[PDB]
Design a protein around this nucleic acid. Sequence first.
DNA 1: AGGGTGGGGGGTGGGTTTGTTTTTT
DNA 2: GGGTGGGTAGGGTGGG
Length: 861
Amino acid sequence: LKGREIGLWYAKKQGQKNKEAERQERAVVHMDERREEQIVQLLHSVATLDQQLLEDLQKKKTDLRYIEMQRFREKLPSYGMQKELVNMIDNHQVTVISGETGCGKTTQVTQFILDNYIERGKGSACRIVCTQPRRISAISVAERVAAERAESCGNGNSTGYQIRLQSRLPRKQGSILYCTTGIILQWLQSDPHLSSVSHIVLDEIHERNLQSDVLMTVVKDLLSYRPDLKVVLMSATLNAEKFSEYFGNCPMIHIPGFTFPVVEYLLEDIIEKIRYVPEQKEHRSQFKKGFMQGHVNRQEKEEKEAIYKERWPGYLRELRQRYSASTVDVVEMMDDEKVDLNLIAALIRYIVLEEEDGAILVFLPGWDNISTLHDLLMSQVMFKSDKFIIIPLHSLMPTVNQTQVFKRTPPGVRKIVIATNIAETSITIDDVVYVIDGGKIKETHFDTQNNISTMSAEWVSKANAKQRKGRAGRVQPGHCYHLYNSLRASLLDDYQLPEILRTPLEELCLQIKILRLGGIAHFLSRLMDPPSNEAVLLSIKHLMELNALDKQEELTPLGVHLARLPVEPHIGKMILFGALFCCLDPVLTIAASLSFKDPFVIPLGKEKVADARRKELAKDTKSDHLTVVNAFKGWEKAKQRGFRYEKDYCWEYFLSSNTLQMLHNMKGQFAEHLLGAGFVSSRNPQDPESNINSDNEKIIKAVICAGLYPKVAKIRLNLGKKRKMVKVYTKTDGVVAIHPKSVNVEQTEFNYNWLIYHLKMRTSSIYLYDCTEVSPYCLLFFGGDISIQKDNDQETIAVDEWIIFQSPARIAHLVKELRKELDILLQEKIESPHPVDWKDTKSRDCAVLSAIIDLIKTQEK
DNA sequence: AGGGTGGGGGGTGGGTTTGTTTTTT
DNA sequence: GGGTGGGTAGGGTGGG
């Protein structure tokens, strides 16, 4: 027999057996004999202040503290451009200010406008509002400005900041408000014209954030209605002319920066000076990227490497003319798919012996490289004494390793920091002088066709290289090392892809309609680098299925509440159903956690211990979002004992104190909006009146399934075959796997063979980052279109033509009819919210449904 | 994303993870 | 080579 014939036929025999085994593993759905009678019976019934500011400023000029602080402000490069910055702003409506690193344009341009208005006399008719891209940056900048003017932030002074759940608002007339980009967008709902604001300043707009792009376009549109409004942009050199052309060829400023001189060494220079010989047998390559990445640029990437291959032979010949032959072969036979950790380890060794005192900071793409490099350094004998200290940096590290990096060190310590791209944004070490830049960064994309979000490693853009280089020469002259040849440095991308072209455009689509800006499709055409038509059409269609939008995008009453809730549309529906079923407190904690981070932090050395503690918190719920509730519940009880007990609890279970505190403040915000709508009767999320079904884990799982319904996976289990194995499938993805960080990674005793996930990614294989099992009743009611069929087994009932259970015809008919009554009741309740009373006979469909979910179940199959 | 108790027919088949950032009154 | 490793994540120009 042919080899292909026997192999192909063998699959058919195995495939038939597998199909014939899944049909016998379907869960049976039946309730009772007495319960059916109850359901059937119910179903049959269906002026002087302006001048006072000038006097106050003159009096403050004699303060000793103010004079001392003013002397330092003179050294800033932006001080010399005070005449030009103030005069041009008062003339043109739109101005662009571009400056290199070192000039304090963020803390000086804002003060220049206020000082000019106060001195000229009409200083009470201005209100400068400055937008910052980070919560920490807003706080730090405001405090620095307050100390510069010899005042205190907030408390009715001339400066302040406002962020989420924290606002030290200054006085009304004059004053400066530093707020994140999100705050300004929320203001547009009340007053779309942004009145009572004289100057609006947008800084750090070169990062091309998601919310920054929306605000910039809205301001441009609003400019016509408000001729007297002045808006100032702040880019960072490079491609600063793009913003000028967008706004209509506005004037530009080129404020020079200030930085100590630095020297840049490429791959050829580093190898030649340190004489690095690669290890033998290390050239064994791997699969040549057998993934076929579907990135947005795709063809742009395919093009750039084409020139690189073409110019490769020419560049190599020129290199041999200058450098030695030994270094030429090393750079030629170097893998470009991964950073050479051996080269970095050798480079750090050379710096210690030869170069002078300083701090070394190295950028790495991800955790895998951070843990690998830390092993190479710790393995060697030299990097083990008390002299050298290594402080890894990552988001998952406990409180970014506290404040060890901030503290200075005596001579000889030579602290070494291994960090991801978290240190380049805002970490303020203020001590490093040698910077090693592994030219690889991790980017998150989104495929409009596969409807999945991937994550891979990409070469750093020319802007990222400049940002990393600028962290060395700030307080002392230093050195910057780049791990790529001169050919790569010329072919690097000028900028990263804007966030508007990546990430799903789901929350942004609802934000457009709540602001009455346009028609979603028309508004997403004046944005710089507008998204592709495929992504816009898919987002609208997905919202239509969720029923957040009408047949002609009219913002159905359900969608109104989703837009005003600062969460994703899927998460927002979970919050709304939590108040309807009176399971408020546990649901709010899950929604807050799903919206922003988890309170679990894993240190470097202890990775296996951290996973063991997380499984202990899960108890026997076989759930991932229920561990957050269990962790939060324990933390609250521990805090009652005392402050000392709370610290011990977080350390024992590797929890994060700051994240848990933020999650507690987020819960109160959600309940405040619900009270205004009318779903609840109090602002306290832990109201005993609205926490009736709060101690039941079955009701909570049903509510979660109501929110994240379309994401459902199968737990098809293969019996035997040595150790037990579980294969997880998806309707549109084929075969997926559970991420090792999840609780259910190694679980093989699932009561029901179904899951619900929230976040999935295609880093290397399709992964589910969190999943919880669901009973069949949780899918029958809060699911798709119920259908009754017959496939020679029984009166099988399907919710989406692929989720199939087993039930008799009589029972299945009752369940389908009950679902129809619930949908009508649920729609009416959302349109006219009410606290709902559990001591009446008006609409008891919810009461009957709760009894079915709470009781019965226990299929265990 | 299968085992090493198949076999080393090939590695151009595959053999566990983990950029950061944001939201009125 | 095996077939309970998979052909809904390998291939037959790898073998039976």
